[PDB]
Amino acid sequence: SFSQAVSGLNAAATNLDVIGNNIANSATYGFKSGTASFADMFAGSKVGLGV
Amino acid sequence: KVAGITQDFTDGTTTNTGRGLDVAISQNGFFRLVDSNGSVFYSRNGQFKL
């Protein structure tokens, strides 16, 4: 019930923070831009559990 | 005098449990089970394990 929702919230928080970090560090020298990579989570049943 | 106890053989519902080793029959039939003595039995409860 809450597993589909709190995992999506925790994923979108890190996706916002890795954008804010690039926006902050856009002026330094040896910086490389990062992106998140997610993947879904499944049990042995057919419905999903989040991300 | 009580002549006998007679059982109603209509089907129930189909509860979904999401487990792996379980089956449920939807029409007429019975699973055949063999005990340790050798005598055979017939059943409808579908919880199996190893």
Closest CA in chain B for residue A46: B18
Residues whose CB falls within 8 Å of the CB of residue B21, separated by 6 or more in sequence, listed in order: B48, B49, B50
For residues A11 and A46, give the distance between their C-alpha atoms in angstroms, rounded to a whole number.
22
How far is it, in rounded angstroms, from Cα B13 to Cα B46? 13
Question: How many angstroms away from the CA of B17 is the closest CA of chain A?
Answer: 9
Q: Which residues of A22-33 are buried (b: 16+ CB within 10 A; e: fewer)?
A: eeeeeeeeeeee
B4 contacts chain A (CB < 8 A): no
Strands (E), B1-50: 31-34, 40-43
Cα separation, B50 vs B39, whole angstroms: 21
Q: Which helix (H) or strand (E) holds A44?
A: none
Q: Answer whether B25's CB lies under 8 Å from B16's CB.
A: no
What is the C-alpha to C-alpha distance for residues B23 and B17, in angstroms, rounded to an integer?
10
CB contact at 8 A, A36 and A15: yes
Q: Rounded distance, CA B46 to CA B15, Å?
A: 12
Residues of A in contact with B18 (CB under 8 A): 43-45
Q: What was the resolution (in A) of this experimentally determined structure? A: 2.9
Residue A43: closest CA among chain B residues belongs to which residue? B18
Distances (CA, A) of B30 to B36, B41, B43, B45: 19, 9, 5, 9
Separation of first and last alpha carbons in chain A? 14
* Cα gap A19→A27, rounded to integer Å: 14
Q: Quick check: B38 contacting A, CB < 8 Å?
A: no
Which chain A residues have a beta carbon less than 8 Å from that of B15?
none
